[PDB]
Each structure stands twice: as structure tokens, then as C-alpha cells.
Structure 1
């Protein structure tokens, strides 16, 4: 029961963020300061994720699917480049100091034109004590985030700006989702697709992924 899980977590000096159900009988999904963990109902066993549902045609990352709750929770903190005819919606962990992230951003109008809406979350590859984290902190805190992001990528004046957006939250989520390098795309089902793909290749990928997921 919950008391057992809490006693086990407390023993390990872990602070439970919330106890959710798991697709496996006998255990729960637990998001903690240490991240997501699976723990048996009796609190006797812990299994580090991720957990995958492999009953279907393709493997689904259930941990990531669950984390989409935390991801969608950051929706207002995302820098969104809306496609006029939104046919696809992807969330991309980006680093303004990454050459490939610049290459992707430079073609944003093409992704948008192909019907792909891009939502950015910050991911400083160099960690929280880096120029990347400071620069993106200022971007996300700007009156106009899109303008600020476009400017910084173009190598312009990154106006000093502060707010309560914590890049550490974006970074932690990305790490938990399995983000290693940038850019990294997160799909609507939680699937992580690390890497850069030009507008055309990307569109086809998104079209095929979708076709081979719903049936």
C-alpha cells in the first residue's frame, strides 16, 4: 500500500512527488527528486525505469508517456512556433550553443510550412552552470520569447532579463526523458527521437511514425 511505499522511500532519503498507477500489477509509478521509479505495492522492490509496453507493434516508453504530464505542465514555458496548418506538434529540447539546433531553427519557417508546430524547452548540454543556461534563462524570460530566441541564434544582443523560469526544470525533464544531445524531439506519445532532421525528412518521419502507431 501507500504507507509501505512511503516508508521505503523515506528510508532512502527520497521525497515522493506523487504515487501513480503502473501498467504492471503489483507495482506503482513513482516520480521523485531522483526521478521516476517503479516500486512494488509492498515497498520491497524498486526497479529503475524506463518501462516499455511491448505488447503492440512498436515499443512504447510508458515512463515517458507518463512524464508528458510534467511536460505539458511546462506548456506556458515553451517557446512555440506555430504552423499555420498544424498537422504535427513536436517538442524539441534545444541548446542555443548547438550548431545543429541553429541549423534546425534557421529552417523553422519550412517546418511550419510543412504543418509542423515546434515547441522548445531549454537543454544546456553543459549543465546548469554554463553560458548556455544563462543565455537561455534570459531568452525564456524575455517579453517576447520567440523574438529573443531568434535574435540570440542570429548572434544578436541578448537583453538582460530575469524571471522565475527555471532552466533546471527543463534540463531535469529532458534528462529523465533520455535526452543526451540536442536537438532532441519528443513525440506526442512520449517517444524521444534524438537528432536533427531537415524539414522534408522530418515531415516524412512524422508521417510514417504516425502511420505505424495508430494502425
Structure 2
């Protein structure tokens, strides 16, 4: 219905829309900066979601599955801190202006020593036309993103690199995934663990989560 949909967004008050297919006849997936919506082809009906596929034994969140493929599409744009002996990979939506994001970053070595790899996406809590977006756009545009991020977090002045990377895409993904604060940890299954967990508590949580969700 593919034009009528954008007329509906153009009175719902919606900016950075992206229309995706949905597994339900007559409906389509609509990714916004405010979340995932489901709209009928004619643009007349909105359903909040998420959506589940129960053509099998368990309910699979199809919304989370689709956002998991967006996330993996953004791996090139992640600032990754590899654990020397990787036991877990976590994705953190972070903001350079946030205090708990400093506290977490200062303990990166501790995370890594425990075998937790941390992959960063940018999530300015101030939203999109902000100084944090600007700073983080610059960091994510560095030749060495790891160094730029470390330097800026440490208080060092870093001349702003420029590239095509768009922090809006990271931010929208976060919002779509349920993020409402930083730092926010997203698990490999797409699970959001809001807020700060010290390295030790983090290792123990991830170990337990792994046991419980492994699949025997």
C-alpha cells in the first residue's frame, strides 16, 4: 500500500521511517526512531507489537529476529574490545557523556580478563540533534575508533574525523530494541539487560543466562 503508509506517518509525526516486509498478510514492518510498528498495506491500522510466530512449538519473536539482523548488519560500525579468551560477546549502547558509561569503560580490561568481549554502538540519550551525536559521530569516524573512544573518554581532545557513518541508525536500533538509558547491554539472543553491571556480576549473569538458554 506502500505510499499510503507514509501519509499515515505524515500525521503520526514520524521522521526516519523504514518499511520492511512482515510475515502477516496485508501488513508491513515499520521501523521508526520511536520503535517498531506494524501497519496494514492501506495505512489505516497500526499495531504496536512485537509480533510472534507460533507455527511450531515455542513463540518466536519475529520483531527481535528482524532487529537481530539489523544489529549484525552494523558490526562494521562497532567499536569492539576483544576479550583475549572470548567466552561472551555483548553489544553495549553507550553515550560518551554518561557517567555509568565511563565507569563501565574504565573497567574494560576487567571485562576482557573475564572473557567478555564488548562491542559498542552509539546511543546519545539527548537524542539526535545533539552534541553527543556529533562527538560520537566523530569517534565512530576515526581511523582507529578504539583509540578515539579511549581518548575522548579519558578527557583528551581529539580532532573530529568525518565519514559516512550515521549515529541515527545506531540510536534508532537501540530505541527499537527497547533501550531507554545507557549503558545498555544487548545479548546475542537480542535480550536487553538495562543499565550497569560490574564485570564480576556481568560474568556471573552471562554464565547463568547461557546455562538457562543453551538448549540442553
State TM-score, norm by structure 2.
Answer: 0.81
Count of aligned positions: 215
Gaps of 5+ in 2: none
- Which deviates further from its counterpart, 199-208 or 35-44? 35-44
* Inter-partner Cα distance in structure 1 for 2:14 and 2:126: 26
Change (3 A) 1:176 1:33: closer
Gaps of 5+ in 1: none
1:211 aligns with 2:211: yes
CA contact (8 A) 2:84 2:115 kept: yes
Change (3 A) 1:183 1:52: farther
- TM-superposed deviation, 1:2: 8.8
Matching residue of 2:23: 23
Change (3 A) 1:146 1:58: farther
- Which deviates further from its counterpart, 75-84 or 17-26? 17-26
- TM-superposed deviation, 1:99: 0.5
CA contact (8 A) 2:33 2:175 kept: no
- TM-superposed deviation, 1:214: 2.6
- TM-superposed deviation, 1:125: 0.6
CA contact (8 A) 1:79 1:145 kept: yes
Alignment partner of 1:180: what SS?
A: coil
CA contact (8 A) 1:122 1:170 kept: yes
CA contact (8 A) 1:58 1:213 kept: no
Alignment partner of 2:24: what SS?
A: coil
Change (3 A) 1:54 1:183: farther
CA contact (8 A) 1:61 1:190 kept: no
CA contact (8 A) 1:90 1:185 kept: yes
CA contact (8 A) 1:60 1:191 kept: no
Matching residue of 2:122: 122
- TM-superposed deviation, 1:161: 1.3
- TM-superposed deviation, 1:112: 0.8
Change (3 A) 1:99 1:58: farther
* Inter-partner Cα distance in structure 2 for 1:150 and 1:205: 26
1:100-149 CA-to-partner distances (Å, cap 9, x unmatched) read 00010011111111111110000111112222111111111111100110
1:12-40 CA-to-partner distances (Å, cap 9, x unmatched) read 89999887675778865454687533346
* Inter-partner Cα distance in structure 1 for 2:212 and 2:42: 38
- TM-superposed deviation, 1:192: 1.0
CA-based RMSD: 3.5
